[PDB]
Symmetry: D2
Subunit: 336 residues, 4 copies
């Protein structure tokens, strides 16, 4: 998109430039395309995204009673499928969100309280987004453990179906899995691999993401469970994903990277990973075979990207690893 | 101070409880002890500390022209000794503060702009503090790479001498070395080692800190240089520390831990470390011999402290280390 | 077989006690069961095994012209299938054996020259064995990178078929793959995992070995190839293993561990591993789920087994690993 | 000595070429220079060295009663100083040699039984040597954990003083410390660093060796103790090294590398290391600053030297390290 190696952010601060790329207003088919009070609600909300700068608390939004209404429905009815259809990671994270983030049916949660919660749990943070970002910019944000998150609710007339990602989909579909350590790392890895990759590689990556983060399945105690946000936020797709109707293939980064897909109707094919550690390993062997004359490694202390393109930059990181192994050597003597 | 193992913070968020412990108002000897306009200035300022909660931008302070005056003097005259008396780390960091943090003689820098700068450089952040904290609480903050920092200027009548640490001492004496990677880790290590240690161990640790962070010397290209904040912020002590008057001993954590010291007059003894990597190694072998039935390791993604007190918690950290070694294996193939 | 945790060797020297367990003389069906000159040849040969002590050069055997004859046939005719049916590891190793170990059609190679060759190539060594050892003792030897190897040739009347493993099967079927680094480690891992395991676990392990080391298949450039010794030493089984007749399943340690099998007729099922690094990882996750209150790690400097059953023994090994990471840190600066 | 980078052995097998470089027959001053029966004894013995090939058991030597006599004296009288003058490592190793290697006053031990013992204890082995090798060849042998060892006894007329290293000096002065893990690694490190170094670097290295392996002192429980072989095998030097007569300096690889020394009279200067781990670290930082465009790492499975001169060869070693960290991760779960 940019050069031989497209420009990519190296400082979390630079995500402020990877937002300049969106797409607004509704289509004919949309639930409130012909509601002017709602179109006003959206512009007001998007505006919080357009004004947001890395590092500021995320502006609260005062939700109207009907907005809270649309929320109460999406919530209650998905709540009912989770115990049977959701992966253990999602139940664990949804319970913590309830215990410390006021997740409940009569109140929409505020992004800043959720971001705070993710930060202390996995280091992930939210950034308010106006709606659908470029593939490269979205994945680039995942690289800093930053989730581009929508703040506006879907139109109240069709609470059970929402084309575009809304806060219901973000808060009930994505956020909970992001509270799990292994999943959080899997997500960042996808963004880490995307950094400065060709538009084609970005495309393959978006697709791996689609078939995992958005619509992935996993097996636990030999039962099949959803973990994809697009499934955890859709009453109908959730039932169908565990049914006998679609085909389910072993998750393999290369097969998934080229599996085509559409987005209006339910998925006819899904990929099951055996465990997140397993899909994480498979995904890294995959970005490994990615043509690149360097590699990147996240610096969690500075929220920066270190480019490893020489013996020296690799040695510098190695030192950090050697410090850590020292600390573990000491913990072994302390515990006897 | 607390129990068999005194309570210690495990979440950066908990530093909000390790502040409840201070000491205010001036003494007879102090430069503006008998200035009521100044005593008002201080109470107003301290108040920003007392109100501060982890995570909020640090309130700017509008400095009066005379305050900026006291600053212009401390600044200009120490500026003049740095090229000859300061360690390379301090010159490098002071230059970056000037290039990106508006360090200059006619304006006092604001804590929030400095904290932002440290965060992107080494992961350190500032927390406004009302003035002298307990040893345990101060070292406990260093554990999360949080520097408890004073916001008020010293009384304008004696700009060249300041008993208590003031913003001049913090911003010109400490901050610059904190922009260096190895020093930043050395500092956090001292706080990391202090966590849940006996009051006696805290005492030994405070002393190691005194003889290093506050008044340490190091050798570079076979010349002796200051890096201690108490030296980098004191015109007179700086000259004397490199003179033929005091005695300088090799830095050794055990000897320093029990070297007595006073604080009204210049130091008669200082310890020289060979390199910060060397003093860092010496200091970790030292907290290693510290009686403790566990060990701690910082989680930079969550700003938390992981207690390593069992094979399982050690294995969990090891996994993070194994992830990293994987990334480095990949960077080696990418660069051929 | 022994106690709560059966006795296992901890020093390579102790393999001298894990030989006391065999099985001699032929059956009706065997090619020279009714040849008394041959039965004499075997007893003489076995005797070299029965007398062998760890560390002595392996006694040469002067092969008779007919023995060399039986060899010339097995050789030449398998030689003809290797280019098309063998894995790259086997071609590479067979070429090195030819270039430095006098592998040729008119001379049977001597164990001591082969052991010497393996020692400098992968650290593996041969030990002369009288014929079929207990599962535990054979796998226990693999733990020290010691291959229990037969010295006697199969009866000259049926050169194309040999029930028991003979030197043709050992030297042409096993040895070559043992010259490959990854395979050598895979083999030792199986023995490492067997150490002090229950008889049932030994049974599962023998079976994993059967379906890999003895009859495994792998895929390379999307073609299927043999690497199992039982295949590389059998003209007929080799053709059939790559045919459309048997079924080939993905290699999975758990499935293979319980796949039944017979040994008189060709295999109806085989498992394909994707790469030896992949099967090696799969096999270690497998011995990981093995019930054991310790773990073992090989000490290559002393040819001993270190039992890791406490924080301290794990810390001791960690130190060796930390030494190595230091050496690699240095090689990074040296190469710039 | 050889080229831009002098040839160096990469396979233990190649030490057979690093022996072609010696120096025989006695001087006027020597205890039996004018004894023709003894000069015959030596030539016979040297001959075992000249004929020796890597890997063969070392030929036993049948010691004459007077030879055993000279031995009984050197032995008994040094035995008497060890409890008070020797480092703990030497006492521990001398006790093991007595318990398993028949070290006693009335019998000279045979090299092959000692080599066997060292091999199972630290991986070190002995190689019979005819007497004083070139610096590069001797250090090059230490790189493979091979100690070039003399087999002939010193002339019976002066049992208390021996110019050249004899088997008394080798077996009582060196061997015991080589049974200690840390010391064994320190010794190999010196040889590892010598590989392909300039003649000048070899010279500095020989000197570090002199002041450590041959005449080093260490401190234990705040007492000073000998560990240098030249001290552990000399009644007189041993007493003097711990006396108030010579000067003792902190061990520092750079200072020692250029400290001059003579060999006829006792040492006027010695260097004390704090612990072998400490001197080992100091020595590696030292070979680190050694001008070299690669680094070497020992392969214990093959007794070879891996040259790390590219990202790829470093990655290959890293993999071995990553395998090990995996094994330790597993031992942590097994022990809970
Ligand atoms: C939150 C909102 O969906 C966000 O703007 C975007 N999401 C996604 C995206 N692209 C992909 N592939 N997947 C997403 O979830 N583009 C941007
Ligand atoms: C910034 C201000 O000096 C801060 O409150 C404190 N500093 C220090 C302290 N204690 C020690 N030992 N050293 C300090 O620099 N107590 C608290
Ligand atoms: C070399 C000879 O085949 C050797 O005695 C043995 N081989 C094997 C064995 N057991 C198994 N499972 N696999 C072998 O290859 N028992 C002992
Ligand atoms: C064992 C005998 O002393 C051996 O031949 C050699 N020893 C030594 C040597 N060179 C040094 N520097 N140190 C030794 O101990 N040259 C060869
Ligand atoms: Cl998992
Ligand atoms: Cl440094
Ligand atoms: Cl492979
Ligand atoms: Cl030690
Ligand atoms: Fe989504
Ligand atoms: Fe200070
Ligand atoms: Fe076999
Ligand atoms: Fe010597």
């Amino acid at each position: 998109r940019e050069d031989k190696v497209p420009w990519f952010p190296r400082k979390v601060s630079e995500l402020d430039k990877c937002h300049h790329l969106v797409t607004p207003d509704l289509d004919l088919d949309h639930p409130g395309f012909s509601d002017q009070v709602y179109r006003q609600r959206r512009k007001l909300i998007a505006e919080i995204a357009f004004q947001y700068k890395h590092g500021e608390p995320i502006p609260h939004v005062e939700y109207t009673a009907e907005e809270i209404a649309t929320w109460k429905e999406v919530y209650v009815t998905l709540k009912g499928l989770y115990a049977t259809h959701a992966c253990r990671e999602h139940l664990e994270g949804f319970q913590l969100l309830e215990r410390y983030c006021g997740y409940r049916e009569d109140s929409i949660p505020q992004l800043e309280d959720v971001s705070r919660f993710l930060k202390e749990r996995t280091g992930f943070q939210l950034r308010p987004v106006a709606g659908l970002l470029s593939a490269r910019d979205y994945l680039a944000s995942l690289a800093f453990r930053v989730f581009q998150c929508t703040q506006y609710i879907r139109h109240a007339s069709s609470p059970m179906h929402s084309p575009e990602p809304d806060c219901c989909h973000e808060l009930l579909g994505h956020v909970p899995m992001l509270a799990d350590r292994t999943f959080a790392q899997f997500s960042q890895d996808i963004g880490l691999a995307s950094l400065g990759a060709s538009d084609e590689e970005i495309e393959k990556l978006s697709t791996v993401y689609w078939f995992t983060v958005e619509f992935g399945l996993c097996k636990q105690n030999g039962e099949l469970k959803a973990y994809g946000a697009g499934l955890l936020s859709s009453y109908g797709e959730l039932l169908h994903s565990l049914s006998e109707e679609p085909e389910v293939r072993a998750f393999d980064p290369d097969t998934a990277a080229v599996q085509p897909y559409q987005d209006q109707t339910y998925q006819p094919v899904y990929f099951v990973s055996e465990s997140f550690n397993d899909a994480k390993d498979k995904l890294r062997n995959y970005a490994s075979r990615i043509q690149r004359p360097f590699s990147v490694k996240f610096d969690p202390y500075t929220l920066a990207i270190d480019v490893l393109d020489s013996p020296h930059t690799i040695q510098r990181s190695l030192e950090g690893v050697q410090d850590e192994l020292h600390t573990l050597a000491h913990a072994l003597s302390a515990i006897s």
